[PDB]
Amino acid sequence: XXXXXXXXXXXXXXXXXXXXXXXXXXXXXXXXXXXXXXXXXXXXXXXXXXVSSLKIFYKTVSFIMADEQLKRISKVQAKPAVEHRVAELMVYREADWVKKTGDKLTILIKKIIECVSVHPHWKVRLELVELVEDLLLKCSQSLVECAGPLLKALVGLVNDESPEIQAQCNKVLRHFADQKVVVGNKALADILSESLHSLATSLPRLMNSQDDQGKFSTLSLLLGYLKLLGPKINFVLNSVAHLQRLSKALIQVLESDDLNAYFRFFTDERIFMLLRQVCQLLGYYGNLYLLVDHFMELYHQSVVYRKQAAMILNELVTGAAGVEDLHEKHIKTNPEELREIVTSILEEYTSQENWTICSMNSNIWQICIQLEGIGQFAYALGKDFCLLLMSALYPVLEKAGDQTLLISQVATSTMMDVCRACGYDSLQHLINQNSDYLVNGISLNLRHLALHPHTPKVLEVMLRNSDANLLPLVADVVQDVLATLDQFYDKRAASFVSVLHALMAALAQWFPDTXXXXXXXXXXXXXXXXXXXXXXXXXXXXXXXXXXXXXXXXXXXXXXXXXXXXXXXXXXXXXXXXXXXXXXXXXXXXXXXXXXXXXXXXXXXXXXXXXXXXXXXXXXXXXXXXXXXXXXXXXXXXXXXXXXXXXXXXXXXXXXXXXXXXXXXXXXXXXXXXXXXXXXXXXXXXXXXX
Amino acid sequence: SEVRLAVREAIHALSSSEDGGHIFCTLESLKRYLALPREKEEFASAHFSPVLRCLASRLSPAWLELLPHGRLEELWASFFLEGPADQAFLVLMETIEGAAGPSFRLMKMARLLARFLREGRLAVLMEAQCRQQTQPGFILLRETLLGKVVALPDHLGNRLQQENLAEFFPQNYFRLLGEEVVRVLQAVVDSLQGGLDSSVSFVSQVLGKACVHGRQQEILGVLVPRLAALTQGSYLHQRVCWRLVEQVPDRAMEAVLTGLVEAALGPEVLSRLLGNLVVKNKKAQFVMTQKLLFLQSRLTTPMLQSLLGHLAMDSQRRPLLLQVLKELLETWGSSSAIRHTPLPQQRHVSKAVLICLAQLGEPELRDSRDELLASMMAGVKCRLDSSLPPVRRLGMIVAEVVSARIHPEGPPLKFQYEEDELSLELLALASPQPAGDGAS
């Protein structure tokens, strides 16, 4: 009679629905029967449930009867009940929604319902249906009048942003939490959330101290939970215990590389965690002053906690910029306060950053992160970065130096950033923009601020410079720069700077130019003067470069110049000194008979060197560069020979020395290709025309 | 113009010494002309530092005797005692750093620098009306100017350094500094030629480093002179002192305020010297004053007494007192809500709540009072938690206080008969005097 009982129950529910008393409360008893029956489509009939005090007494009975309801929900969590989930969920929703209006002491029933809800929280996304159900469940529950268990419930209602398909439902629910489901002006939920967040921010010292991707769960809970309190965090920030615990936590998480437009370090080996962390620090745009101040503190505190705080500050200001949207009835910050904060942080960064190999790359990390911070400051504060140009120009420009890849790369990026944010168009062009600042700054630095290595800033501004149309102003300072390590001329960091600026001016005048004449004159003058030093081949390099550039209209300067120069060289030259020979080859640009006699004396001296390859090829190329009319040097070369062979000054020098028929060198000894010796032919042929 | 060659000739003569007559003549002549200032600027430093070095570090203790007719050391000093303003101090410091020997001119170097300070210590401040320069230069100049004390015995610290620094090591030097900032302040005040704030700005940058390392010498020995020099119809004095306390470098802004309120005489004079806007114009100062209110406590019985006193005094025309009241009460409700700070800060914010509760008389006594009363009582109920009665104690006393100054009619009187005699209101540790304080 299973079909008989089935049809009986079905037609009974049908007759109910066709038709619809105190004793009707005993109705719920059959609902108890309906709660654990054969359950084809059982619970349907229960839907006949629904100045309503009658409804209120029915709800009293139903509060007594929700025991079997929660039992069946847990059974669905254990037994199949793969579709009755939504049924019982909506049943509980309707029931618990039917009573919170007034005259509801119900504290005992309240605690019982809180126990039941804590039990029911054991359901989380069995399929699309279970998640979809729990969504509306939390929606209706948290929207009720007042309770105290929702501290747990609301928690999972925020961490529900991790599903596969229903994420839009959770998002639109959080959207709905704008004026009705509020953090708002209901202190109870707020303080319960604060109490939660406190233990949260006390755990992360340990939570991320374990395996990966489980920490993401906790950090995601964190980021969502903050996203709840869009505004109204100053109501929980203000407590000193909160800020202390949160700061001390975050200091240890961030302390394995980073990139440009934040990534953490040791024991955080996954990158999406780092993106979520920089999104959660960026989450703070409630108040600025408190945050920036309490973190500047942590920077000033010690050494091992610095880089973390720097990255923090970068994330904080970038968050203060503004790219998603939260509860949109609140207010935003002000540009002028941004100006104050950026001025402060930039001044501290610049003044603090100008200088155990572990500690050395540590300082490298420090300067790199500070440069990146300047870059982010430019990026966020794009427009109003104009009142404080120079404050950012000078530090990194002088820092644009030794470390090309890392340091100078981040530098270049920061400068093109301030360009594209302020319209400065290829940072080289920024030198062609306001420059007198740089001129006077470098000048007064080298003039008063002597004892400090301001060596490479001039290199960056003159060798990597733009067009030299500004050197006519720089000239005197250049001249001063020339006199710089030439008046006292007793300082290692000044003589090295003199050699540096020499190489730089040589390169610039080489490219930029083709005034400059006398510039190169005094340049070579001072260079040759200092050439008498020890291990200063830079003098030879600068000499070669200048001399190459100084041979356009060098009427008499070059003459006595090279005279005294080769004098001192012969005094000194007696392994890369052939570069001066290259300079001599550069001297071969416009050399004369004076250089001929000089090279004659040079060959006479080099004759002392034996007839003994690297050095053989060096001397070979040196002879072959110009070969300034060798007559006695002809015989010297005459008394394997690729250069002396390729000489080809005449058809009588090596040809006579080509009667060997030997083993090895003879193969190349008889390698004459063309004769072209018909001079007398045409000479006499002149007698066949006229 | 041609003097530059003489300059060369000077350093020539200076580098070709033993020619007593020639060097005496050239040095006295150069002193004679120690309107174009450009070459006088190159002379002012670029000849000043070379002659200084080669005449102090290069010459042996026999130049003074080459021509002992009471003029050689005279011109030596008169080069370094006056003349060009800035570079003198700079090269002096740089040398005494580099020139660190047992004694060659060391004692005489100290005599030189001291005798310079003693007479005309301004020498830079008054000539601060400058256009602009490089920032690391400012850095070195100010840091030296304010660390001179510790910088001195580093190079030579011993019995001789002790007798050098047994009269003025601290406790006199910063006294000088304070005296000098006094003089230059009053000078730029009575000037009234062109409003500089440049000397003001520079001496404020001074006050910065001074406060951040020097702890408390200048506070009284500045404010009492400031009190005096402001108490009259001191238009220029008051305005310049305002602009001085204002543009203090925001980097610290905290030691300045901490000291300025700590040793100050009373609320009235503190309110007179700072300025009505200095707390309502520089938002960093908002943050300082009200973080001292909320976050920390230093002495707080007379200290925060005076601090909140000045808060109210300044708020004689600022409708900011109600906002700070609301925020204070909200923080009280949160700290009573959340796992709380230790008892010190608890008593601290308590006393703060009382003193700010002093001022009243306005509408809106409907809802703020409701939230405060309800939150406080609901917390104090369970606050003891069989854990530490003092915390509970705290609440109940402010109960009376809030009862006194929430709606003084009806139920509070019942409190006066129920929660004032049989409610543990017997201890006299710090209950009676703050209770009386509650009466404003």
Nearest CA to CA, how far is A451 from chain B (Å)? 8
Contact between residue A193 and residue A154 where contact means Cβ atoms under 8 Å apart: yes
Q: Is B381 on the interface with A (CB under 8 A)?
A: no
Side chain identity at residue B369, one-letter code: R
- Counting Cα atoms < 13 Å in the Cβ hemisphere of A433 gives 13
Side chain identity at residue A326, one-letter code: L
Say how many C-beta atoms besides its own lie within 10 A of residue A663's C-beta: 7
Degrees to nearest 5, angle at CA B108 with B105 and B113: 115
Contact A194 B291 (CB under 8 A): no
Say how many C-beta atoms besides its own lie within 10 A of residue B104's C-beta: 14
d(C-alpha B154, C-alpha B314), whole Å: 46
CB contacts < 8 A, A to B, total 88
Return the closest-CA partner of residue A354 out of A370, A332, A342, A339. A370
Q: Which residues of B touch A289 (CB under 8 A)?
A: 283-284, 286-287
| A188, A237, A240, best to mutate vs chain B, most B CBs in 10 Å | A240
Nearest CA to CA, how far is B350 from chain A (Å)? 14
Residue A196, classed as helix, strand or coil, is helix
How many helices (H) and strands (E) would you count in chain A? Answer: 35, 0
d(C-alpha B388, C-alpha B384), whole Å: 6
d(C-alpha A455, C-alpha A460), whole Å: 10
- CB-CB: which of A187, A242, A448 is closest to B137? A448
d(C-alpha B435, C-alpha B440), whole Å: 10
Residue with tokens 């003001």: B200
Q: Is B90 on the interface with A (CB under 8 A)?
A: yes
Q: Is B213 on the interface with A (CB under 8 A)?
A: no
Q: What is the resolution of this structure in A?
A: 4.2
Residue with tokens 């970068």: A314
Nearest CA to CA, how far is A630 from chain B (Å)? 48
Nearest CA to CA, how far is A94 from chain B (Å)? 32
Nearest CA to CA, how far is B211 from chain A (Å)? 16
Distances A683 to A366, A420, A677, A688, A689 between C-alpha atoms, Å: 81, 73, 12, 10, 11
Q: Which residues of A touch B140 (CB under 8 A)?
A: 449
Question: Which chain B residue lies closest to A188 (C-alpha atoms)?
Answer: B337
d(C-alpha A121, C-alpha A74), whole Å: 10
- CB-CB: which of B134, B135, B287 is closest to A289? B287
d(C-alpha A605, C-alpha B166), whole Å: 70
Each residue of A360-384: b (16+ CB within 10 Å) or e? eeeeeebbbbbbbbbbbbbbbbeee
In three-state form (DSSP H/G/I as H, E/B as E, the rest C), the secondary structure along chain B is CCHHHHHHHHHHHHHCCCCHHHHHHHHHHHHHCCCCCHHHHHHHHHHHHHHHHHHHHHCCCCHHHHCCCCCHHHHHHHHHHCCCCHHHHHHHHHHHHHCCCCCCCHHHHHHHHHHHHHCCCCCCCHHHCCCCCCHHHHHHHHHHHHHHHHHHHHHCCCHHHHHHCCCCCCCCHHHHHHHHHHHHHHHHHHHCCCCCCHHHHHHHHHHHHHHHHCCCCCCHHHHHHHHHHHHCCCHHHHHHHHHHHHCCCCCCCCHHHHHHHHCCCCHHHHHHHHCCCCCCCCHHHHHHHHHHHHCCCCCCCCHHHHHHHHHHHHCCCCCCHHHHHHHHHHHHHHHHHCCCCCHHHHHHHHHHHHHHHCCCCCCCCCCHHHHHHHHHHHHHHHHCCCCCHHHHHHHHHHHHHHHHCCCCCCHHHHHHHHCCCCCCCCCCCCCHHHHHHCCC
Q: Which residues of B touch A198 (CB under 8 A)?
A: 338-339
| A434, A448, A479, best to mutate vs chain B, most B CBs in 10 Å | A448
Q: Which residues of B touch A194 (CB under 8 A)?
A: 334, 337-338
Question: Which chain A residue lies closest to B95 (C-alpha atoms)?
Answer: A451
Experimental method: cryo-EM
Q: Where are the domains of chain B?
A: 1-119, 319-440
- Please give the structure tokens belonging to residue B199: 């000397």
Return the closest-CA partner of residue B332 out of B382, B386, B289, B374. B374
Return the closest-CA partner of residue A374 out of A448, A458, A447, A314. A314
Contact A487 B46 (CB under 8 A): yes
- Which residues of chain B from 19 to 48 reach within 8 Å of chain A, CB to CB? 45-46
φ, ψ for residue A376 (rounded to 5)?
-60, -40
- Counting Cα atoms < 13 Å in the Cβ hemisphere of B300 gives 20
Say how many C-beta atoms besides its own lie within 10 A of residue B344's C-beta: 11
Question: Which chain B residue lies closest to A354 (C-alpha atoms)?
Answer: B136
Residue A436, classed as helix, strand or coil, is helix
d(C-alpha B137, C-alpha A447), whole Å: 11
Nearest CA to CA, how far is A450 from chain B (Å)? 10
Q: Where are the domains of chain A?
A: 182-325, 435-567
Burial of A61 (0-12, 13-18, 19+ CB in 10 A): middle
- Please give the structure tokens belonging to residue B107: 């004692």
- CB-CB: which of B90, B284, B345 is closest to A240? B345
Return the closest-CA partner of residue A70 out of A93, A46, A104. A93
Q: Is B201 on the interface with A (CB under 8 A)?
A: no
| B51, B135, B144, best to mutate vs chain A, most A CBs in 10 Å | B135
Degrees to nearest 5, angle at CA B331 with B328 and B335: 140
- Residue A101 is classified by DSSP as S
| A186, A190, A239, A488, best to mutate vs chain B, most B CBs in 10 Å | A239
Q: Is B144 on the interface with A (CB under 8 A)?
A: no
d(C-alpha B280, C-alpha B259), whole Å: 19
Return the closest-CA partner of residue B398 out of B363, B355, B362, B364. B355
- CB-CB: which of A239, A343, A441 is closest to B334? A239
Nearest CA to CA, how far is A344 from chain B (Å)? 6
d(C-alpha A445, C-alpha A262), whole Å: 36
Q: Is B333 on the interface with A (CB under 8 A)?
A: yes
Q: Which residues of B touch A242 (CB under 8 A)?
A: 338
Say how many C-beta atoms besides its own lie within 10 A of residue B409's C-beta: 6
Q: After which residues is chain B broken (C to N over 2.5 A)?
A: 34
Nearest CA to CA, how far is A351 from chain B (Å)? 8
Residue with tokens 């089935």: A6
